[PDB]
Amino acid sequence: SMASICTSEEWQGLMQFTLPVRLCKEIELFHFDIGPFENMWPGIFVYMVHRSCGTSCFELEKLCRFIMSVKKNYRRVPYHNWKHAVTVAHCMYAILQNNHTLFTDLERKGLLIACLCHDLDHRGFSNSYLQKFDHPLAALYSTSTMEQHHFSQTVSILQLEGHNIFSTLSSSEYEQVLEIIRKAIIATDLALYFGNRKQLEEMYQTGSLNLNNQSHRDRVIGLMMTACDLCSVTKLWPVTKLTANDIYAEFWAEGDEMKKLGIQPIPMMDRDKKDEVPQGQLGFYNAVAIPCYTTLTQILPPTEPLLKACRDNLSQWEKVIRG
Ligand SMILES: COc1ccc(Cn2c(=O)n3ncnc3c3c4c(sc32)CN(C(=O)[C@@H]2CC2(F)F)CC4)cc1
Numbered sequence: 001s002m003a004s005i006c007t008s009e010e011w012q013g014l015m016q017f018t019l020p021v022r023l024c025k026e027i028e029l030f031h032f033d034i035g036p037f038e039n040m041w042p043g044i045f046v047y048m049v050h051r052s053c054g055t056s057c058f059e060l061e062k063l064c065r066f067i068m069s070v071k072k073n074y075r076r077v078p079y080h081n082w083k084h085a086v087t088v089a090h091c092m093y094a095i096l097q098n099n100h101t102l103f104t105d106l107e108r109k110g111l112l113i114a115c116l117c118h119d120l121d122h123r124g125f126s127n128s129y130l131q132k133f134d135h136p137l138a139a140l141y142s143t144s145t146m147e148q149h150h151f152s153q154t155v156s157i158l159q160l161e162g163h164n165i166f167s168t169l170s171s172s173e174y175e176q177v178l179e180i181i182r183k184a185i186i187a188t189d190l191a192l193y194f195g196n197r198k199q200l201e202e203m204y205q206t207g208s209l210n211l212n213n214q215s216h217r218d219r220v221i222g223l224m225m226t227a228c229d230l231c232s233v234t235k236l237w238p239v240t241k242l243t244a245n246d247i248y249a250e251f252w253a254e255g256d257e258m259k260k261l262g263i264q265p266i267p268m269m270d271r272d273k274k275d276e277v278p279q280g281q282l283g284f285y286n287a288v289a290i291p292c293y294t295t296l297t298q299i300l301p302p303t304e305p306l307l308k309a310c311r312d313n314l315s316q317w318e319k320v321i322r323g
């Protein structure tokens with residue numbers, strides 16, 4: 001196969017994890033930072049699945065094997081790594097906990113799994129890089145290159161022995177949840193977000209948005225995926241700052257490769273233009289993050305703490321640009 005497999009040690013150790021009780025109250029908050037609890041991230045995902053979907057939603061042995069093999073199939077890149085996957089999944093947990101009955105049992109188990117899996121086997125390169133330099137992945141996946149690969153890696157991992165946590169769903173539900181996951185992972189291609197958000201904005205603003213319309217439903221799930229994927233801008237400012245360092249470590253490394261290939265990168269991927277990052281952060285908050293959390297909060301009012309935190313980090317960036 002293409003997917004690596006966890007060891008017996010790794011998935012057996014997971015089964016006996018118990019989350020410290022203090023972290024039970026903290027994990028429910030949107031601003032929660034998994035940062036200082038690395039050893040607990042797999043157990044934190046197990047806990048989140050059990051609160052959202054119930055303690056016997058998956059077979060524990062299959063769930064731990066799945067989680068530890070997902071971990072192993074994230075690479076040690078600066079930003080698109082195992083930490084990012086658990087961070088995105090936790091944001092989804094918080095969204096779902098606060099909007100619990102708006103989503104089906106199938107969607108909640110799908111979206112938590114999709115979030116943990118959404119960057120599987122990321123190489124540290126953008127879709128743009130892969131298609132520009134004719135990476136083999138881009139020959140295989142013409143559009144949303146990495147995201148098609150991530151979903152393909154999710155299916156590979158499910159196909160590993162004893163890994164298929166969804167095999168006890170009905171044949172129909174099995175096929176529905178894999179579709180829920182496929183769309184959710186594809187939706188994390190930020191190139192698709194801008195059109196998705198303008199559509200949602202117009203549906204909401206005209207009163208036509210209807211969560212029981214499946215096409216509207218897919219779009220709302222997609223915006224949730226974006227909101228989760230971007231959620232470093234919803235943490236406390238020192239956490240947001242530290243995560244920015246990882247993001248730009250990965251960007252700059254891409255820009256270093258572009259330079260080697262004789263093609264100057266955009267300033268935000270050029271480490272000799274670090275001075276421009278604060279202004280680029282302001283533009284990203286204004287053009288992307290703020291509209292995303294604003295439209296999400298209009299559709300799902302309980303998600304407002306994300307927008308509040310995002311505005312707060314916008315102001316910090318504005319202070320950087322000033323003093
Ligand atoms: C490293 O790979 C990625 C890809 C996507 C994300 C999603 N994302 C994100 O979560 N956060 N959080 C704070 N800021 C960003 C942010 C910004 C993006 S994407 C993005 C684009 N952008 C650039 O500077 C890029 C280089 C360029 F100009 F193309 C402005 C900032 C994160 C990391």
Ligand SMILES: [Mg+2]
Binds near residue numbers: 118188189
């Ligand atoms: Mg991605």
Ligand SMILES: [Zn+2]
Binds near residue numbers: 088118188
């Ligand atoms: Zn991501």
